[PDB]
């Protein structure tokens, strides 16, 4: 119960926290959490309409604008940290950016100071993140 409260509240007054601290609270080795169920067809259709899913798929090839898909990222970020969406094999650095964009609603430039990694790599890191994300939707759709 406390965790899912914290996920919503990073928007309010917990955005000032550094991304590393938020990662430490949400994941605790002491109390392991079993993986939540993989994304279902009715749940995925409710969250993402086909046009929204189409936008993620075609942008994955492009890697051009980064302004078309900013809306979907907070929706995507919640699923990953809710133990849903299976396993994305996100790295520690990659998980930090997803939390920063999705939940703290920080721009990429601000996280660059925070993460202290160069933006070009951070952009390329986020490019890898959504790539793992977009095919996993396709795996869900193909299973139907």
């Amino acid at each position: 119960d406390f965790r899912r409260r914290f996920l919503a509240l990073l928007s309010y007054q917990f955005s000032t926290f550094s991304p590393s601290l938020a990662l430490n609270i949400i994941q605790n080795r002491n109390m392991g959490k079993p993986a939540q169920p993989a994304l279902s067809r009715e749940e995925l259709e409710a969250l993402f309409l086909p046009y929204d899913l189409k936008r993620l798929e075609m942008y994955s090839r492009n890697m051009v604008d980064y302004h078309l898909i900013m809306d979907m990222i907070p929706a995507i970020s919640r699923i990953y940290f809710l133990n849903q969406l299976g396993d994305l094999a996100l790295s520690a650095a990659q998980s930090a950016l997803l939390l920063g964009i999705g939940l703290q609603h920080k721009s990429v430039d601000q996280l660059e100071k925070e993460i202290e990694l160069p933006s070009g790599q951070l952009m390329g890191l986020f490019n890898r993140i959504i790539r793992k994300v977009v095919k996993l939707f396709n795996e869900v759709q193909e299973k139907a």
């Binding site: 590393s20 601290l21 990662l23 430490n24 994941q27 520690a92 930090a96």
Partner: peptide, 7 residues
């Protein structure tokens, strides 16, 4: 990982 980043 995350603990190393905190350090």
């Amino acid at each position: 990982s995350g603990q190393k980043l905190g350090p």
